Short mmCIF file of C-alpha atoms and ligand atoms in Angstrom, two decimals:
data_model
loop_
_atom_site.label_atom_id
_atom_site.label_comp_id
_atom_site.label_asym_id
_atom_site.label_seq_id
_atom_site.Cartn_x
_atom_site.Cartn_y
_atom_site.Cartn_z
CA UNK A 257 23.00 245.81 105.37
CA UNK A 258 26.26 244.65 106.89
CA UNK A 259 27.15 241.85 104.73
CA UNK A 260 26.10 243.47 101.45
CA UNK A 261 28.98 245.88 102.03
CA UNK A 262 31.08 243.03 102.57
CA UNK A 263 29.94 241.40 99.47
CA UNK A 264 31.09 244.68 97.83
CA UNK A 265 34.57 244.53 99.19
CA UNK A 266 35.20 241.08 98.71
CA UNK A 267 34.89 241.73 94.69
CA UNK A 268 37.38 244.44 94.95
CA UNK A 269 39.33 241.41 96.92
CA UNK A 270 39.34 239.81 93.43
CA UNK A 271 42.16 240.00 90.91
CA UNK A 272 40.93 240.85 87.69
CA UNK A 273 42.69 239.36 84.21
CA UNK A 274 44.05 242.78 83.05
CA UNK A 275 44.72 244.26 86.22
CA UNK A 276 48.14 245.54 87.27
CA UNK A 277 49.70 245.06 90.80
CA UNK A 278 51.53 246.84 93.42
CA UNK A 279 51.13 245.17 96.32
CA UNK A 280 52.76 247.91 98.47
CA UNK A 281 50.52 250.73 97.58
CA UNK A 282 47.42 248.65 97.08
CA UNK A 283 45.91 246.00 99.00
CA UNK A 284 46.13 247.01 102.07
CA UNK A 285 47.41 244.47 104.63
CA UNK A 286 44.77 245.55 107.50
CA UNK A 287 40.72 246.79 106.41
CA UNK A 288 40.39 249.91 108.69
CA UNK A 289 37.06 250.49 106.88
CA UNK A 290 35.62 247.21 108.36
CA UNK A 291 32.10 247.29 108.17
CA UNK A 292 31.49 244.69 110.95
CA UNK A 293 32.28 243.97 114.48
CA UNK A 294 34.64 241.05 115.73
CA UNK A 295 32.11 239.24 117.57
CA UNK A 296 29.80 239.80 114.08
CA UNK A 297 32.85 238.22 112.29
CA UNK A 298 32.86 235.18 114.51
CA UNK A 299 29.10 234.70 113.68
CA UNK A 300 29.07 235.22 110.07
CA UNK A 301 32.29 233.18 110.04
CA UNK A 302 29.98 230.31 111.92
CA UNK A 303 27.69 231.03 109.41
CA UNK A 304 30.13 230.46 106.57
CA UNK A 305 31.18 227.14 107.73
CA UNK A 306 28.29 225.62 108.28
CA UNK A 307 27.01 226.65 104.57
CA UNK A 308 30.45 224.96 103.60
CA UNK A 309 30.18 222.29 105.11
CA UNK A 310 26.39 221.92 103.15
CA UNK A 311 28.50 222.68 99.83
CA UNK A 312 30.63 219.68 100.77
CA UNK A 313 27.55 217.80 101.22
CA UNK A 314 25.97 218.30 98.31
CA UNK A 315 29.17 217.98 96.57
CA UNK A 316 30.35 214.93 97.60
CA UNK A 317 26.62 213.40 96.75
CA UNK A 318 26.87 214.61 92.96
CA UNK A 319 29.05 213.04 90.57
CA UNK A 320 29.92 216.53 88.56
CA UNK A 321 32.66 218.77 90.27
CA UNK A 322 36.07 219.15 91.96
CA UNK A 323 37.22 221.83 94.01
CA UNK A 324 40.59 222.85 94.18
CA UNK A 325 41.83 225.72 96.96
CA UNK A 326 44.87 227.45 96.25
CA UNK A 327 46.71 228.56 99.65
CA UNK A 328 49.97 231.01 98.88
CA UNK A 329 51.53 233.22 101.65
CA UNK A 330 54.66 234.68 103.65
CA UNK A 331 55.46 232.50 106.34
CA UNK A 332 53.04 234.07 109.85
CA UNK A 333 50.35 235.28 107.22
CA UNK A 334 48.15 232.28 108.70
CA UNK A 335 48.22 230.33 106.00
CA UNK A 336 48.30 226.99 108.24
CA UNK A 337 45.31 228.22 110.69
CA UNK A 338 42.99 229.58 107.81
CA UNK A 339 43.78 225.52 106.21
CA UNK A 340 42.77 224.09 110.19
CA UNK A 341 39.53 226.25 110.39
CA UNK A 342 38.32 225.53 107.01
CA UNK A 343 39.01 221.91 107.60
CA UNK A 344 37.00 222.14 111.12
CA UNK A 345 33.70 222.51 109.63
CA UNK A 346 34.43 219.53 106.88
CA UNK A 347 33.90 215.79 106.49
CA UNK A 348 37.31 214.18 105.95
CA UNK A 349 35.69 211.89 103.27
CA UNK A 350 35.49 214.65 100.92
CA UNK A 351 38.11 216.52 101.63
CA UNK A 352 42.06 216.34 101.05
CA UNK A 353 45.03 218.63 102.31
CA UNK A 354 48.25 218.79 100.39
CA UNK A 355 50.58 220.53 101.92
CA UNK A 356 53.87 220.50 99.13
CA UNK A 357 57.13 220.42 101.01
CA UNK A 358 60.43 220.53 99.24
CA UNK A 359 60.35 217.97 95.75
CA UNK A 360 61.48 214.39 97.04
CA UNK A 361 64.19 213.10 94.32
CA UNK A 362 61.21 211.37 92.56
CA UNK A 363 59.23 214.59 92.27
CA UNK A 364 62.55 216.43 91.35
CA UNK A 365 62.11 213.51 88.44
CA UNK A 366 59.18 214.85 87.04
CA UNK A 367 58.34 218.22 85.67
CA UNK A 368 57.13 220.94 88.39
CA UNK A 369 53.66 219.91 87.86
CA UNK A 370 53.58 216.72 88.10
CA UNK A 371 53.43 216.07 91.53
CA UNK A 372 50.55 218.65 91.93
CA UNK A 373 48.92 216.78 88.62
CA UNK A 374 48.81 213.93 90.80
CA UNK A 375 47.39 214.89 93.55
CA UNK A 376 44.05 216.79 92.08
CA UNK A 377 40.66 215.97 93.73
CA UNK A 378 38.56 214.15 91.83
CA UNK A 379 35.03 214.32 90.99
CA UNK A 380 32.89 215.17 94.28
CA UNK A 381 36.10 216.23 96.18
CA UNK A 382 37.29 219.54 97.66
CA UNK A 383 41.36 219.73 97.82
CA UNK A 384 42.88 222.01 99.25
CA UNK A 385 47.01 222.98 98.10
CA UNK A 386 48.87 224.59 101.19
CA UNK A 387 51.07 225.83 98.87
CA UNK A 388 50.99 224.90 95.30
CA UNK A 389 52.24 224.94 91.74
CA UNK A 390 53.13 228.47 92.52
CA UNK A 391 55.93 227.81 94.43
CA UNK A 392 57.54 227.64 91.21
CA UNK A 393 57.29 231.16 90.03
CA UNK A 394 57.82 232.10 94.00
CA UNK A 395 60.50 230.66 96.01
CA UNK A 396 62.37 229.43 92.98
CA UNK A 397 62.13 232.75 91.71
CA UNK A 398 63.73 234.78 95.14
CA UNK A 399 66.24 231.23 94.49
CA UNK A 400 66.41 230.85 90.78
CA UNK A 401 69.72 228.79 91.89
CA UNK A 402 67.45 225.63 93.01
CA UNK A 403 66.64 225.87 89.04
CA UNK A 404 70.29 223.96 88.26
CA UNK A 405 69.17 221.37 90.36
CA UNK A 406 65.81 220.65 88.85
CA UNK A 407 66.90 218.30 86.01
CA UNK A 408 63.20 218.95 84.12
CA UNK A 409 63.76 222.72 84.34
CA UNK A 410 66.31 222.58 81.48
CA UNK A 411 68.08 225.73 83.01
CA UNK A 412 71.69 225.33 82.81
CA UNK A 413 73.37 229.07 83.53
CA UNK A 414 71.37 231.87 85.95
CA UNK A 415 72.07 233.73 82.65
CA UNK A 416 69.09 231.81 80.77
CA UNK A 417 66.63 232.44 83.88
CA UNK A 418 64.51 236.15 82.66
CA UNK A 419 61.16 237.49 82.29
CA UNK A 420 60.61 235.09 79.06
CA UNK A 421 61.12 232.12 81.57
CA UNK A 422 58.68 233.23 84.17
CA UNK A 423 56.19 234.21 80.77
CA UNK A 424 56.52 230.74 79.83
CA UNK A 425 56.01 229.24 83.42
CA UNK A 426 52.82 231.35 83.49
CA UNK A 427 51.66 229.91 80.20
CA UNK A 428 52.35 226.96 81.29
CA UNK A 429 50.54 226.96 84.38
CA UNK A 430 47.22 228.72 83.13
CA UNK A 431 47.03 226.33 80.29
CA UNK A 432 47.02 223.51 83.62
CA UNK A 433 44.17 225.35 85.26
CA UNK A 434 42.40 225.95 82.26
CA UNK A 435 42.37 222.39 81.13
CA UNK A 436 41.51 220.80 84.80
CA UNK A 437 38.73 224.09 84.97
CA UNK A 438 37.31 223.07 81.51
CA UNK A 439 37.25 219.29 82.67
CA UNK A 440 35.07 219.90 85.90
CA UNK A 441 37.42 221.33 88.53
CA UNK A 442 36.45 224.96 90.30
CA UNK A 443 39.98 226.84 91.13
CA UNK A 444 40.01 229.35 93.62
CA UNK A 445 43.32 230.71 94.71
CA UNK A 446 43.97 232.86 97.45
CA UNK A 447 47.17 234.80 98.33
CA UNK A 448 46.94 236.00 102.48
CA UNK A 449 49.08 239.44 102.16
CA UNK A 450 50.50 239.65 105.36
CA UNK A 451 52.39 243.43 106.53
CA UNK A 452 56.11 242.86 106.69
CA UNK A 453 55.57 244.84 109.57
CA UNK A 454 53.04 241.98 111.03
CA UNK A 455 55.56 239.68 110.20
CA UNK A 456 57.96 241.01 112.34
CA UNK A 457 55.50 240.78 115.42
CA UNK A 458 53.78 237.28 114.73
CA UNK A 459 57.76 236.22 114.66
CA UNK A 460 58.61 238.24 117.72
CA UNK A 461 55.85 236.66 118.77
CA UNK A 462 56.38 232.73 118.50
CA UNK A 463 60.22 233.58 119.28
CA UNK A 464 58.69 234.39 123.11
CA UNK A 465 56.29 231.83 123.65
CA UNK A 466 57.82 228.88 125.32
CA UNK A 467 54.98 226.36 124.46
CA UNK A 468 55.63 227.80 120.70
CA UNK A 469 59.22 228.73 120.19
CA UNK A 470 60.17 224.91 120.05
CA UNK A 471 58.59 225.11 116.47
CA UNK A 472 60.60 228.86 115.48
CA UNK A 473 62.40 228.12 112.24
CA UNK A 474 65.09 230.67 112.00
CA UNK A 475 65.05 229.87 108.03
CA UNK A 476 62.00 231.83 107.81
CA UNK A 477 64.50 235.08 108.62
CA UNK A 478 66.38 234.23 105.32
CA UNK A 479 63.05 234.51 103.23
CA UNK A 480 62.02 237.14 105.25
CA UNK A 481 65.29 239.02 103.93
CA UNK A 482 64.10 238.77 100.47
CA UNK A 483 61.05 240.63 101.54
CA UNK A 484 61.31 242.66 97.96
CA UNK A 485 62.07 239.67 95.95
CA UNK A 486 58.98 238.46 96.82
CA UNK A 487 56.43 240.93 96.40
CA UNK A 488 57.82 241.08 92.67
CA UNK A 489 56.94 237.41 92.29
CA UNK A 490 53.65 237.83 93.66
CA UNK A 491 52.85 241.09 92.23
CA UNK A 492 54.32 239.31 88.30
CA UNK A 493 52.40 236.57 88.90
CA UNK A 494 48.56 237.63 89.94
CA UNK A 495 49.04 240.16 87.14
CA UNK A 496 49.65 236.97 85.24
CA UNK A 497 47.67 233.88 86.26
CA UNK A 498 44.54 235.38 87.68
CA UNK A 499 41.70 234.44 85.08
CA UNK A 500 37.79 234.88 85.21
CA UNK A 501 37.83 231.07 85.43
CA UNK A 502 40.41 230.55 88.10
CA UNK A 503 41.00 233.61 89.64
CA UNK A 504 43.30 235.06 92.56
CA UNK A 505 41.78 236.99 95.99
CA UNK A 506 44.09 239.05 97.59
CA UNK A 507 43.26 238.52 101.44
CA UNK A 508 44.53 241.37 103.92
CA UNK A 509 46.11 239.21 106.61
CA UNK A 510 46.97 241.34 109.40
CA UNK A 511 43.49 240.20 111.69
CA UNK A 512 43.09 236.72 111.99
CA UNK A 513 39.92 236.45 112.35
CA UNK A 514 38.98 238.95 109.44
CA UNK A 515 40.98 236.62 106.94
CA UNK A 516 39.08 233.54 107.82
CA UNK A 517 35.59 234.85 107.62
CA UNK A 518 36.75 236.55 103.80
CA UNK A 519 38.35 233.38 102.83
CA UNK A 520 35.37 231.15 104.05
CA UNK A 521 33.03 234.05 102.74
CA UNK A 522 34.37 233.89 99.21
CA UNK A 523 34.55 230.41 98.80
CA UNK A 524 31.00 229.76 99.78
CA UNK A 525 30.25 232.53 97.42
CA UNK A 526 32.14 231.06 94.41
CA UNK A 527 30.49 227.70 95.36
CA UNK A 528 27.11 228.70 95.35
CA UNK A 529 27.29 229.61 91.98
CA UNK A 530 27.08 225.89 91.08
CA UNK A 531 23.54 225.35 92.39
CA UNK A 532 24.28 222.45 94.07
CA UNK A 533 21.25 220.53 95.51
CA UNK A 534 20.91 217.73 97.91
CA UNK A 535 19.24 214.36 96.46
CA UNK A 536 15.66 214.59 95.88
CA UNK A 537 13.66 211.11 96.71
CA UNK A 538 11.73 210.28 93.78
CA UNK A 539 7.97 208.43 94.10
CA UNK A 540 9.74 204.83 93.59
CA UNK A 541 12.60 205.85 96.25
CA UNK A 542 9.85 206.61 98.15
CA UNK A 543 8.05 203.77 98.17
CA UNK A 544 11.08 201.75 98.46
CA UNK A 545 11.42 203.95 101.69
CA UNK A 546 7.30 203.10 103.03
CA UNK A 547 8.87 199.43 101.99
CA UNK A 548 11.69 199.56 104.53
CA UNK A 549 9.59 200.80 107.23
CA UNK A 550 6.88 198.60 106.75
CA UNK A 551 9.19 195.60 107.31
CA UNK A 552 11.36 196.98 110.69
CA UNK A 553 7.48 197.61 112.25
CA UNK A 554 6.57 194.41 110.87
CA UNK A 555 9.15 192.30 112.66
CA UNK A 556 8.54 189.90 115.35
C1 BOY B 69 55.66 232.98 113.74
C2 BOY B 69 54.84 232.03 112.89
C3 BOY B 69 53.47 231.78 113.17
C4 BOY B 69 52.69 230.90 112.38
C5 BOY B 69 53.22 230.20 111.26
C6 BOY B 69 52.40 229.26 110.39
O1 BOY B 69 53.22 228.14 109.97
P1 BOY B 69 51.74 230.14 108.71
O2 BOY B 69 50.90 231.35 109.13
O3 BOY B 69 53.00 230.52 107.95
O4 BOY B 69 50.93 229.05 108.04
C7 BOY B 69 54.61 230.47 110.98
C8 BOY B 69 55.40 231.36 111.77
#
């Protein structure tokens, strides 16, 4: 069957504690194997948001779990319309977007996980980071300059900033998941590995669309610059942070479409592990019910 192949590539989509990573020769950036049409995609992708939008459901009726969703990416990966179609299928009530920006001069007050700390779903809750903690073994490692600003980083000279200090930030930030994952929070983090050659045309792209081009920040050339930088950081850190309990996919995000139906594929997947079951109406719920009904046919 179709989709047991897929279920077979999405665990080779998974990065695995010990594995190492080399995110140029591996992973590639487009499936050409793809066992499944586009229009197929588009109906198992229905498929996979209507079953997570019944997760939600039943997760927002227990009391147990939070869900947190780990978004990292190159700018043009998709990152913002894999967040939108996610969200589409999704009661608001239960679910909460945080999509981290620069550090306001309060955050920049705290340490680099505060501000993340804070905003954690709680019990019953899905949220979802568009971009996350990660940032700080990303960006700020392509920039390890912004470190001298960050009073809590206690980084005084470039010299000081090595391996040992991206070790430690590692440490640091799978003893967070591990503590929030031991205290009733499911992590799932996904990284959408988008072609530097995509990059180029999805930028290309926006540049020549008037309705779009309004929105073209020529920033995103600077980062794009540091291509290499990058790719380190990732590759050091899912080598580094991707645990059986919180682990890291590795989406290929060169088709649209195909990212969104892996993503929401994966994360019903992962959710569906916790069994989750609607309310069941005992006998005295029940009655209570017969009670109600008896009353509305029994008015005047
Ligand atoms: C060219 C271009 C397209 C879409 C985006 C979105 O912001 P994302 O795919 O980075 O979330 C950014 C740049």
């Amino acid at each position: 069957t179709d989709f047991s192949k897929l279920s077979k590539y999405v665990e080779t989509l998974r990065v695995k504690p010990k594995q190492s990573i080399d995110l140029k020769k591996d992973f590639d950036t487009d499936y050409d194997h793809k066992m499944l049409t586009k229009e197929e995609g588009e109906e198992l992708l229905n498929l996979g948001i209507s079953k997570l939008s019944e997760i939600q459901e039943k997760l927002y009726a227990s009391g147990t779990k939070s869900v947190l969703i780990v978004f990292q990416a190159m700018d043009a990966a998709g990152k913002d319309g894999t967040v939108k179609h996610i969200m589409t299928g999704l009661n608001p009530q239960g679910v909460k977007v945080t999509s981290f920006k620069v550090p306001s001069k309060i955050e920049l007050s705290h340490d680099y996980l505060w501000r993340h700390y804070v905003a954690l779903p709680a019990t019953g809750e899905i949220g979802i980071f568009n971009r996350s903690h990660y940032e700080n073994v990303l960006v700020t490692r392509v920039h390890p300059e912004y470190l001298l600003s960050e009073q809590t980083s206690g980084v005084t000279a470039i010299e000081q900033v090595n391996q040992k200090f991206w070790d430690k930030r590692f440490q640091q930030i799978n003893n967070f998941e591990q503590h929030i994952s031991e205290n009733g929070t499911i992590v799932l983090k996904f990284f959408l590995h988008v072609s530097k050659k995509e990059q180029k045309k999805r930028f290309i792209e926006r540049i020549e669309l008037d309705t779009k081009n309004w929105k073209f920040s020529t920033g995103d050339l600077k980062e794009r610059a540091h291509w290499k930088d990058y790719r380190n950081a990732y590759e050091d850190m899912l080598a580094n942070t991707s645990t059986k309990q919180a682990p890291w996919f590795v989406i290929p995000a060169d088709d649209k479409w195909f990212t969104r139906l892996l993503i929401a594929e994966i994360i019903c997947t992962e959710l569906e592990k916790l069994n989750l079951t609607f309310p069941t109406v005992s006998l005295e719920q029940k009655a209570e019910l017969e009670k109600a009904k008896a009353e509305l046919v029994a008015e005047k």
